[PDB]
Write a protein that binds this ligand. Sequence first.
Ligand code: ADP
Ligand code: MG
Ligand code: ZN
Ligand code: ZN
Ligand code: ZN
Ligand code: ZN
Ligand code: ZN
Ligand code: ZN
Lengths: 198, 590, 75, 142, 142, 662
Amino acid sequence: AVGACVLCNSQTSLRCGACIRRPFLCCKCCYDHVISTSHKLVLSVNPYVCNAPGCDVTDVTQLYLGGMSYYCKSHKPPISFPLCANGQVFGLYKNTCVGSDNVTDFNAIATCDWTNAGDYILANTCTERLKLFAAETLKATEETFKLSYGIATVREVLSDRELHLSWEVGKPRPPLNRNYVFTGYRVTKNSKVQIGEY
Amino acid sequence: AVGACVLCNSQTSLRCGACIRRPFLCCKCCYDHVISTSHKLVLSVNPYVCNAPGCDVTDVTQLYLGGMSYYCKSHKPPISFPLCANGQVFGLYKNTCVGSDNVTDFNAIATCDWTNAGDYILANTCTERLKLFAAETLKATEETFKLSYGIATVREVLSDRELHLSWEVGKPRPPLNRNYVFTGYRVTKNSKVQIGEYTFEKGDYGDAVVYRGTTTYKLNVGDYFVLTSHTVMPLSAPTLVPQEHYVRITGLYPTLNISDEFSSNVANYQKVGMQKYSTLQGPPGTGKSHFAIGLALYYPSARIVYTACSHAAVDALCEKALKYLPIDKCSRIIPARARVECFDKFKVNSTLEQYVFCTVNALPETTADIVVFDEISMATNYDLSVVNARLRAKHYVYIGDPAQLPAPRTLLTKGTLEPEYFNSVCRLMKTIGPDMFLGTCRRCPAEIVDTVSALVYDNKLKAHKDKSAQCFKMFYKGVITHDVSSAINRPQIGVVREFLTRNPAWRKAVFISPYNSQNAVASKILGLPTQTVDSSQGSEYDYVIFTQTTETAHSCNVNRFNVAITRAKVGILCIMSDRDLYDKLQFTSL
Amino acid sequence: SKMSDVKCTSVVLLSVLQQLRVESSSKLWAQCVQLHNDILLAKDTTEAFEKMVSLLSVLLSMQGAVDINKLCEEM
Amino acid sequence: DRDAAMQRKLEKMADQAMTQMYKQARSEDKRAKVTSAMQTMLFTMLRKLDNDALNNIINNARDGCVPLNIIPLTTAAKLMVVIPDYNTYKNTCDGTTFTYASALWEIQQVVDADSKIVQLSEISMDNSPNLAWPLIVTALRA
Amino acid sequence: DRDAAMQRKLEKMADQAMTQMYKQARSEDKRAKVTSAMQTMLFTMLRKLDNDALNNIINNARDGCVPLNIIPLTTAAKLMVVIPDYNTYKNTCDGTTFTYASALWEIQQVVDADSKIVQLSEISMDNSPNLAWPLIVTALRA
Amino acid sequence: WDLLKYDFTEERLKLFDRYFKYWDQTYHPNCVNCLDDRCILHCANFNVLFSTVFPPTSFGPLVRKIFVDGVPFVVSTGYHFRELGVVHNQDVNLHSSRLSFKELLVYAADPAMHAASGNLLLDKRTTCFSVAALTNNVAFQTVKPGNFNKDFYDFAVSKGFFKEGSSVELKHFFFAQDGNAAISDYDYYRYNLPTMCDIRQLLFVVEVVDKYFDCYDGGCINANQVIVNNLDKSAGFPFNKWGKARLYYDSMSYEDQDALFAYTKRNVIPTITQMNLKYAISAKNRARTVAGVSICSTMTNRQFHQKLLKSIAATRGATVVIGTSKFYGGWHNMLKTVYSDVENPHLMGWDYPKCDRAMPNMLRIMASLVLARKHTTCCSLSHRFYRLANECAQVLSEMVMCGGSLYVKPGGTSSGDATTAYANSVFNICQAVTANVNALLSTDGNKIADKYVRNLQHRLYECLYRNRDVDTDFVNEFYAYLRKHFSMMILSDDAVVCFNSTYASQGLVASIKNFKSVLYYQNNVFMSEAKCWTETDLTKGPHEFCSQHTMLVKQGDDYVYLPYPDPSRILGAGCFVDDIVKTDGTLMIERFVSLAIDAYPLTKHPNQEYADVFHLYLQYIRKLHDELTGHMLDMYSVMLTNDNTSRYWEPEFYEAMYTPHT
Ligand SMILES: Nc1ncnc2c1ncn2[C@@H]1O[C@H](COP(=O)(O)OP(=O)(O)O)[C@@H](O)[C@H]1O
Ligand SMILES: [Mg+2]
Ligand SMILES: [Zn+2]
Ligand SMILES: [Zn+2]
Ligand SMILES: [Zn+2]
Ligand SMILES: [Zn+2]
Ligand SMILES: [Zn+2]
Ligand SMILES: [Zn+2]
């Protein structure tokens, strides 16, 4: 689909697949982000991957638009051209892309894993449009790290007032307070449905 | 798209650029209009701008047609030719055009600003097509200048499906109409040029508008939307349909022994019947507004469309028809706006009835047997054209008196317009005389009519009544509180209040004042029904309370006093500031 | 060539009637269509002309639709 | 020849543009005025026919003697025609017969704009102004 | 001319891909719009279902499957009878209540082919010709 | 009966065991258990009779309440065909969470939701069962008259046409219809009675008809090999509210197109089909209606049939002349392959009255099964049965939306499905072969002198009513007999035969009376002999095939058959256009070029007033070009640089369109 660039609100159809939320970027911004930092995966209306029968290349700057598909150096047809060139990445609305030198703080907001306090303090100085994406990726990382926790289960019928818990060993136990809920899973002979939240 | 030249009607495709109404023009006529005036931009099926990647040369006297594009002098190709050559501007139907010498008046009509008082007299004595074009452009210029807009600019472009809005504080904002266009005015310094015509309809959530554009460029940060043009509906019908005299009544079937009150106008009803369009001129309160009803009662089988410019005149006609005509077989039309209160006693919005009443701006595309246009004094050429275009009727009757107040003409602020230039019908009446005439006051007491029979009419107006002596002339200075650019006179209304308890017979009078704010605030102070001088024309009132606010040029004009005071059926109280007006009236000194 | 002329005048007349929104009154559009289809499927010119008269009477009956005076003066 | 090829390409593009512009302009012109064109064509053909019945009803409708309902074809069917004048009444109505559509109808009922049934006796030159025109004649085919 | 004339074909190929890409982006934008329209249509029909009677009749079924043709016949709350002539009216929905599909319907409205309301007292043997048949009578289950 | 009762298997079995007790073949009331396609026909032919003693409200889709993300849908999970018995979907999801485009399309196409949501309907205008009324007010659709082209008519009458007593008079006009057009034309389905075709003879006519379709090849194709002709055509109901067919052929990838197709091979998708009124020039005032089928049906039917259907349209010299042009010496080739060495030729042509509204359900099923004998490898047997069930549920007898109201279609082919010309061609060959079989058997037998034909009749009766398994040797023998004495040429309902005359007079091959009898007892329509023609002289071709008369003209040094149309048709196509922008003329010179291409053969007609039509069109094209140049030279100052219209008003350009070279 088409939308607005996250940091300049210019029409675009590019999308950095390397990011967590896959934000929209314009040709100028996408080129800057894929030429500055380690992100080398972009998604247009079709993925920017080598559409050969057998091959695995995803670097945009190492890809070429051949015929009606994308091929890398190894097996591209004799016809040009490299997808990344002229300070741009091929995409829609190449004649309406407005540049923006916010690629540095954008990279800091995107590529960071939000471990150190620096990421959060630099996540509030940014503009509102980028701050929204920062918050969304923060929440996505929080959810993914939540999935990377040790799950629990009720041992058996213990009591109505209180229970006892058995956990999958080898993984940390989440703190237990009113701000931390868990969902029961019913992976029995029948289905896997959620019976309750505790 | 092609069209017809305004001033020669030949086929063509060249619109002019800097005229407000975006007219069509012939080849020779366009050459003469652009070579003699400041209008240079010309629009064929494609504009006549230069075709260099960066260049702005619009003067058609410069450009050259090369290949299939237009290039300035610098960017000219080797093989080409100029557009403005051999007395013509290059366009379609090049050698099947016949020009005309009327460009002397068309240049003035399209060049002027409608603020002087020579512009309006020019727009009432030219050819019919030029009359129509002048009225159309005058309406457009009014809608652009008066109550125009506040400068709006889009902060950011959320999407092309819905735009963002930001009105400038200090000036009002006009609403959506596809007829409105807000020119793009990114005025920073980079290409201060119209980037399209847009209209804005806000949504029901947040601050966003689902706009409709006419160009294909995204909104820039500094781009603004300024109301510098309005697209009035292009009118075609002439201001006055051609006259044709008959020898017998056709399409109208006279009655015998119509009534007692209308027996005097039998010959005038015959005169209406024997002509296509007839004009009746009568000083105020002399009997035009019931002459229409007597016309109705003299041709009972003839479907009639009473129409008027404002809402008060149609309401007075409704009053008299309900008083004389069968109430059941009548009607009354209200617009989809339904903004103003109307006369709700007939079957409303029933067009197919034998007696319709309407405002000229809300007429339906129908026929009739006779259309009575009431109070043409408030009619511009646009209204005459609209009524001629919408209502195809066998007979027209234009009743009105130019001596009463004319249409607003808000742009007019310099000079003065004679009565005979208000519109085409007023010119016909004052030039060659009215087809019918009836001067004898039948509404207001003999005292007040004797007063007014000298200010405006040279005592050619007779009275058949008795001097009620209820015409009080009072001289109160009335300190002025110029609050909202509309004079408010608190001491004057207070003095009216203190003398309103002294008169038991004047408790149900009507308040009139030449200032809207004073009229509106008079309702709260003493509770009377207030009506300004402009909108009270046509109605009849028994006791009137008038308060001339300030010594000025607005409230001090004789015609406005005439129309304000002649609305008193039996008595009136007038407060005054001007001494000269105090010098010639014949009222009780109080 | 008078039989192959009523059959075209009927087509033009029914187009005119359909442009005046006679289509919106079923009881009348049914009669108009019947007369049109009967004129087209006619052999004797007298029947075709009689149905033509009856169908043109539909157009003449409504007064606010056409302006017979203007249209007839020009011709 | 290299230059002439480009000249011919530009010329062919110009011809394509001219043809497309002509098609568009004429199509919009033809669609714009279809009601007026169709009515004028109708009456041109309808005069070209030059039939007695069509001419009679058209010439009557010009004067105001229009029928209030479809002219019936079957024998002994009811026709309601408005008559606006004593001259139109005199030309068409003779005795209790009525000449309309090049056919002779028999008058059944003459009413007025007052919806009061009047008789053929009152309709006379001297008495004509008294009647509230336009009359409505209800007749049957013969 | 080795490098040039490959640029012309290079740009020609690039433009072709871009125009195709523009088309595919538009295609994936129309798909979402039609999908949203279909979802809204299905859910709006859901809100129209008469869930109580539908549940009553489907719970009676053995497999839970019932013929579609009866889902209205036993659950629809509003019935429209289209009638071509007067005899059918008198035979099917005479009066203000009638019996169809083993139910008792009460006539709430009656319109003609022009969508103009027709009062039930206007449908008579002698007044039949004046009505624009067929008549659509709308009744509600009682 | 209980209103909720849809499974009448026990009742069908009881009827079979009470009446046809000793009929020794098996009988599966639910045709989904049938062993092959010759056991579907048998059990369906029994069901089409046993289904006339059960309530009509019991047929149609079998709805069921499912739940999608907790909200209750009512969706069709089966069907109850009058012929095929009860069919149950194999993939029913009682609890779903997300609806993809495929499932949304399926649940929006089927009529369960629309019928359940809408009001009840009781339509006394038609005898056909009426299911529901979607809107609150019924919609009445009219048909406008044609737009007169006065310039061309004036030109014609100035060229001496349309004079009193001429042989070329206008007969094709644009007829108008009142608001009762759509429903008074859908009402003609009342001529479709439930017909129980003779089975021991239909199961042999099927073998011969299949032999007629042996040259071809067919099968299933992937979604990326289906080629749609025009993608802007409508998409039926309810899909026409949101776009044309392009929207749904673009929104759906190839993967989710194959998904839907493979879903239909093990499921039944009931579908609604609109009835659209046709706005076209015709010679009779009756309204013409066409069944606009949905896109959910056309997509899958194309993927299923299109290989065979485009192999039929690419074979020359076969019985089914579809895809063979009448230009470039194609009409002559057709008419000379018809004369495939038949001893005493006589040309014959019949006419099916109400062909698409009277066709029995058994024979439409037969045509759909003969078209599906090419899936011997691509499809299994259950796949083929469920494809047949889908064809019957979407085409044969499905909900018809006729002006904002769902009725039930009793039967007969819908004339807008994905296979309408070819299915009707299979029908037409079936009727011809049945006429031949009846004519050969009903012959006395002792009067037959040719000792080969007497034994052939003997073996034909033996192979009909004394054998249960095909006898391919005799099927080939009878097929060879038919092609040696009954050469056919079939176009979708219109047949020309070159039958042997001696045999037909003796009675050993079908004649007109045999076709009338066959139509009487297998269509419930009486084929009047006043519309079927017989030509005894081959030197003037068939009297009328495909609305084109034939005439033997001289070209070069030899003689060829040229097809000329009805002059009134071409004149009425010129005079009465169906739009206001086609009346201008100068915009449409290709219209008149094509009409002149069609009307060229008239120049070689002996009747001068016929031959004058071509020259009228050429002169009108010349006038149109002249005034077009005038108008374009006034609208500019330079005329067209390369105006190559000079060849459209010379007869050579058209004369080259009926010459065999290209
Ligand atoms: N023939 C008459 N005799 C007596 N009084 C009349 C006669 N005609 C009109 N009037 C009165 O004079 C008044 C004239 O009203 P109107 O027509 O509004 O005045 P104008 O048209 O002169 O402004 C009416 O209210 C009516 O009551
Ligand atoms: Mg008055
Ligand atoms: Zn990224
Ligand atoms: Zn960007
Ligand atoms: Zn200008
Ligand atoms: Zn320039
Ligand atoms: Zn079986
Ligand atoms: Zn298959």
